[PDB]
Write a protein that binds this ligand. Structure first.
Ligand SMILES: *[C@@H]1O[C@H](CO)[C@@H](O[C@@H]2O[C@H](CO)[C@@H](O)[C@H](O)[C@H]2NC(C)=O)[C@H](O)[C@H]1NC(C)=O
Ligand SMILES: *[C@@H]1O[C@H](CO)[C@@H](O)[C@H](O)[C@H]1NC(C)=O
Lengths: 275, 365, 89, 150, 62, 50
């Protein structure tokens, strides 16, 4: 938000009605008296504002046409205010962050959206094997990070734009901390597993017990103990809430009314009553 | 099944049924066992598969009677002995089976199969697509921080004005005017109330502007995509689309028992209602997403009244297969039938036999 | 675009290589194989994007037209004053 | 020259009784050029054929005026025989396919030039020698408008 | 490469069919009596709600 | 409805072994620079809107 009282109309036409009320103001005290000067001053300055300050109606049987259409001018100006303000608030689009790895932001990394991976990892080699992703690797090789924990802190601090990494670890990250979002779904499937030297005696037994645990249900039931979903979801589906900044300017004008009244009443009445 | 064959009470006015329909015997054991039960009633069978059966008799002079399957649906080799339609072939209770029989390798060993006559796939169907807004309370357009300040900072001009006017206007009457003017209904009293009335117009118009911003940049849920969507591969969820119906003992029951147990563990909420009685749950609201073969789904997507949208469609497929008529083991009828489908593949009767039983009648605008 | 022309492959005048690659190029465009090559090197982020920041009403373009119609209506009262008084006296 | 009737490029109008088609003036009052066309039967679906002089004017005919002015030409214009542009199709019970329509009358030898909205593609480029393009375009779909209810 | 077809070049050196189109372009920066008066007031409020909505959508047009 | 899903062009046609081939392809290019093809566009394919 910005300039509540000044965003839509703080220019030539803002002071238009400031003097467009004065031209009609005096033009009525001279239209009735010449076949009260405050009466026309307060009336037009009030009917534009739709205030409940009843005062003198247009005495002239002919002056009633301008007042019945002056309201229409006041009736039309505030409507144009409302429509214009809505357009400005709608076109304040917060973010259109990213798609999967096909966006033109990904392909051409001039400066915006620098993406880094953990050095010497499996991902950093996969991006060197694919022939299509040559420029994408050519930008990633310039700079990267050493540890997974380092990237999370940098991204959260907004020092790194995007972070490409494993999904199992990243899914646990966003769900728990809740300052982060996973960009869609996976685009490369693979798996985990134990690793042993070739021709090791246990190469058959350890592989067997993994298969047994899957059908048994122990491994599946263990995940809940260390993987869970809580406290944070797809909320914030409301792309605005008027801040305490524009209303403050709206709160500013009412304060000026208070200072204007007390200062003038205390000072002017002393001079006027004494004389 | 729903589209491929249909069974009905034949004709309450003639005993038989309207022509181009064949009577079939059906056994329903939904009664007690005191003396006996004879549920074999003269119904009638109309559908696509009957046309194929009625088109092979005219070719190879076949003769037949039609008997239903005594239990739910197709079966698989489980616990050592099969259970379902295939058992009637294996247990010498019948000779052949006709209908929506998806070909597979787990059953081709114990019974032969012919060339398929369709091009089917497996897709996901979800509930109706609906457009509804999500305003919780009408007080949303401001955060509650503004309301309390708006409410309290409005109360100070309530007290200040009567102090600058009493030194007439009743103390109680003054507070009424302040509330009334900000709700648009009703030099000592004029100066402050003038710009104070402006205070009402300046922000009341912004409420309209904000609500005009809430109802434009909002959107509904994306009607999540196929199998690899984020809502499925994370089966640890109690209020997602919570349905993985996958009718019990079905052909697709074995497919979700291949490699990954993360799916078969949460697929235990299946409902034994074969297809239709459990399908209306997706329309009722107690079921969210039901997985089956695209052949009987698109016809149900279009021919059904209203709108209930399947996934992407011809692109949202996995393990595309076909339906074929099975030849029992030690039965050389394969040459006789294989000529029939191939002959029916040549003359172009596949389209004519399709458009009389499978079509898109009234697509959703 | 003004004075529309196209890129090309400049080759020696009256050469025997012309007919061979002339048909090859026409083969490429007439099969869509250049479309895949075109969408890899000529792509921008905001190609399908357009949203003006604002057209702030702090400018006399339409409210000015309203302003001068008020002056036109304002002169009706003066004319009515003469007509009403003269016809009644 | 061979020409085809296409709405914005080549217009075809019946001539006056005197033989010359009536003159007309554009929005700026300048004389619009016209040439006399022989060719079609004046009855496409309801008679075998019979030729008759007519009048032509349009985009291609205007360019032909400027084109021939530089080249110091002497030109006559006759329309196409059976409307169609041209394609390769095997004639009834024969050995090989032969060209159709407007392209046929030029490859056969009935004309020496085609000034008409003819496209550029590989199949025609084998047997004909084109020129540098004088207009760029594409393919689009035309549909009927939707009522803005009330 | 990025070579354009025009008059003078085609005079002395042959050319192929254009495969990328181009030209010349310009780029710059971005009682029953009072029952009726009730009806008139009813039409007035709807007319404005229609007016401001109509202008706002016209105003949202990039 | 919408944009265009194919791109091509027009052109004059002449038989193989033609002497005018080299010359007419020059006039077509020569007219493009002089703006001749631009005003022909402005004559009777444009300025006819509803
Ligand atoms: C294409 O145009 C050129 C230029 O007008 C022609 O070249 C002229 O041909 C005549 C014919 O004998 C000669 O007398 C001139 O001396 C040529 N010009 C020059 C500058 O030498 C050319 O003949 C035209 N092409 C054809 C096929 O006629
Ligand atoms: C054009 O051809 C005519 C023959 O009809 C000839 O007399 C004339 O010299 C040629 N050139 C010009 C510029 O007319």
């Amino acid at each position: 938000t910005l300039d509540s009282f000044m965003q839509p109309f703080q220019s030539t036409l803002w002071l238009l009605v400031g003097l467009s009320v004065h031209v009609v103001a005096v033009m009525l005290y001279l239209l009735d008296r010449f076949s009260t000067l405050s009466s026309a001053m307060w009336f037009s300055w009030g009917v534009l504002l739709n205030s409940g300050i009843g005062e003198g109606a247009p005495r002239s049987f002919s002056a009633r046409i301008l007042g019945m259409v002056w309201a229409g001018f006041a009736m039309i100006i505030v409507a144009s205010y409302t429509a214009n303000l809505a357009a400005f608030l709608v076109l304040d689009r917060p973010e259109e962050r990213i798609t999967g790895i096909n966006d033109p932001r990904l392909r051409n990394p001039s400066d915006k959206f620098i993406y880094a991976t953990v050095k010497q990892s499996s991902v950093d080699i996969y991006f060197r094997r694919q022939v299509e992703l040559s420029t994408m690797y050519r930008h990633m090789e310039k700079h990267n990070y050493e540890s997974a924990a380092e990237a999370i802190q940098a991204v959260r601090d907004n020092k790194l734009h995007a972070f490409i990494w494993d999904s199992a670890v990243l899914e646990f990250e966003a769900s728990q901390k809740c300052d982060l979002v996973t960009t869609g779904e996976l685009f490369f499937r693979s798996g985990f597993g134990i690793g042993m030297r070739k021709d090791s005696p246990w190469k058959q037994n350890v592989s067997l017990s993994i298969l047994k645990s899957h059908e048994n249900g122990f491994m599946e039931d263990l995940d809940k103990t260390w993987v869970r979903y809580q406290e944070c979801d797809s909320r914030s589906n409301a792309p605005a809430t008027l801040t305490f900044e524009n209303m403050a300017g709206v709160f500013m004008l009412v304060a000026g009314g208070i200072v204007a009244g007390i200062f003038l009443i205390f000072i002017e009445i002393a001079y006027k009553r004494h004389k | 099944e729903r589209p491929f064959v249909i069974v009905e009470s034949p004709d309450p006015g003639t005993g038989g049924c309207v022509p181009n329909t064949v009577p079939c015997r059906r056994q329903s054991n939904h009664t007690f066992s005191s003396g006996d039960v004879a549920p074999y009633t003269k119904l009638c069978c109309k559908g696509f598969c009957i046309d194929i059966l009625k088109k092979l008799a005219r070719v190879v002079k076949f003769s037949y009677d039609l008997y239903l399957v005594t239990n739910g649906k197709h079966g698989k080799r489980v616990r050592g002995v099969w259970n379902g339609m295939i058992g009637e072939v294996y247990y010498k209770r019948a000779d052949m089976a006709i209908g929506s029989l998806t070909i597979n390798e787990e059953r081709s060993e114990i019974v032969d199969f012919s060339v398929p006559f369709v091009e089917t796939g497996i897709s996901v169907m979800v509930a109706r697509s609906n457009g509804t807004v999500s305003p919780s309370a009408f007080l949303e357009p401001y955060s509650p921080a503004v309301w309390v300040m708006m409410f309290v900072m409005c109360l100070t001009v309530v007290a200040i004005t009567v102090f600058m006017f009493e030194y007439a206007f009743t103390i109680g009457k003054s507070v009424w005017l302040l509330w009334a003017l900000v709700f648009n209904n009703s030099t000592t009293s004029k100066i402050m109330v003038l710009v104070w009335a402006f205070f009402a117009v300046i922000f009341l118009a912004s409420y309209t502007a904000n609500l005009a911003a809430f109802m434009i940049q909002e959107q509904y849920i994306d009607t999540v995509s196929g199998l690899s969507d984020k809502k499925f591969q994370r089966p640890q969820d109690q209020y997602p689309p919570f349905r993985f119906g996958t009718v019990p003992n079905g052909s697709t029951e074995r497919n979700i028992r291949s490699n990954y147990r993360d799916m078969h563990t949460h697929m235990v909420k299946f409902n034994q209602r074969s297809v239709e009685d459990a399908l209306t749950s997706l329309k009722m609201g107690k079921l969210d997403a039901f997985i089956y073969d695209a052949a009987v789904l698109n016809y149900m997507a279009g021919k059904d009244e209203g709108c209930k949208l399947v996934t992407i469609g011809s692109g949202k497929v996995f393990a595309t297969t076909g339906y074929g008529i099975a030849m029992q083991k030690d039965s050389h009828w394969k040459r006789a039938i294989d000529l029939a489908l191939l002959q029916f593949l040549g003359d172009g009767e596949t389209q004519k036999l399709e458009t009389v039983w499978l079509s898109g009648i009234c697509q959703n605008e | 675009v003004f004075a529309t022309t196209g890129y090309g492959i400049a080759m020696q005048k009256d050469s025997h290589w012309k007919r061979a690659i002339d048909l090859a190029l026409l083969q490429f465009l007439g099969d869509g194989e250049t479309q895949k090559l075109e969408t890899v090197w000529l792509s921008g982020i905001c190609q399908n994007e357009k949203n003006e920041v604002m057209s702030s009403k702090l400018d006399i373009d339409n409210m000015a037209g309203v302003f001068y119609m008020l002056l036109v209506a304002m002169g009706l009262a003066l004319l009515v004053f003469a007509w009403e008084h003269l016809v009644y006296w | 020259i061979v020409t085809i009737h296409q709405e914005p490029f080549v217009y075809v109008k019946p001539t006056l009784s005197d033989g010359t088609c009536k003159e007309e003036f554009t929005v700026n009052g300048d004389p619009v050029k016209k040439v006399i066309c022989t060719g079609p039967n004046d009855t496409s679906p309801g008679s075998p054929r019979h030729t008759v002089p007519q009048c032509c004017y349009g985009f291609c005919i205007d360019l032909l005026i400027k084109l021939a002015r530089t080249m110091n030409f002497t030109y006559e214009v006759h329309l196409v025989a059976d409307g169609k542009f041209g394609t390769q199709e095997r004639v009834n019970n024969s050995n090989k396919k032969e060209w159709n329509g407007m392209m046929g009358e030029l490859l056969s030898g009935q004309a020496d030039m085609i000034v008409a909205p003819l496209t550029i593609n590989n199949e025609r480029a084998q047997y004909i020698e084109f020129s540098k393009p004088f207009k760029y375009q594409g393919l689009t779909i035309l549909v009927k408008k939707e009522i803005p209810r009330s």
